[PDB]
């Protein structure tokens, strides 16, 4: 029925030299004596301090170039490991499909869009002064540097799921199912179908809606045919999906999604990593400062605005379409 | 040492 895949090694994109770039503090406002016309009318004065200013600014330029190289490495890696939700149509073929392993820094991380990643490198200066006054035209430059070259511009974000255990989106219907299908495909595509599992419950499953999990062998079961479908956990009842997963519930990671806002949300959990996803109708208003785990997510036009006290947390969201996911499943069912 | 020096301190 299906072909065979062999565990060819993963390729390595050049990682980050995650060190501690250090910057020398500027000079210390050298005291300038009065010009004194008497000894200035013949035809440690400004010339020397200007020379020193120029030297420090040159040094600063060099450091800026180096940190930009580091930023280039970082964006290169992050683009390599979370491509845009169209290239993934071509990935199921080549030797990079199950290229994610539990030893690798990117594991069970699900891309959702592009915004400012804070440049994991250090950027620490060794300031040792007790409010001594530093030269104005150097300190100004260093300060104006340490704020714009510290955060990478729009970069592939990460909605990691290895330490969330619950995701609950809020907002319009299909805008939600978009980001959901998006990162759920991005998840299944990179990791061995023998390593992580997914579950579904929805009323109109086979209508161009959640049907598309048909050809999915990530939703599979061990030792069961179900006639045509791998496991076809794809259902409409909640506790029924639980029972279909009750033996599978026990590490193969589990990803249970629920297109139903009602029908007893939070009824399996609340375990040790098995993640639940549930689209909700409406929000809490005074949540007790939601834990970074099991958080709240609102879907704007192109934002995925987190819930904190609105901290958009994504400025351009990654959205998928239904038919695209359909063609994804179709292509991937081959190997 | 110029007067204008200490006056600056």
Curated annotation (Swiss-Prot), chain B:
It comes from Mycolicibacterium smegmatis (strain ATCC 700084 / mc(2)155). Part of the ESX-3 / type VII secretion system (T7SS), which is composed of cytosolic and membrane components. The ESX-3 membrane complex is composed of EccB3, EccC3, EccD3 and EccE3. Disruption phenotype: Deletion of the gene impairs iron-bound mycobactin utilization and EsxG and EsxH export. Part of the ESX-3 specialized secretion system, which is required for siderophore-mediated iron acquisition and for the secretion of EsxH and EsxG. This is ESX-3 secretion system protein EccC3. It is found in: Cell inner membrane.
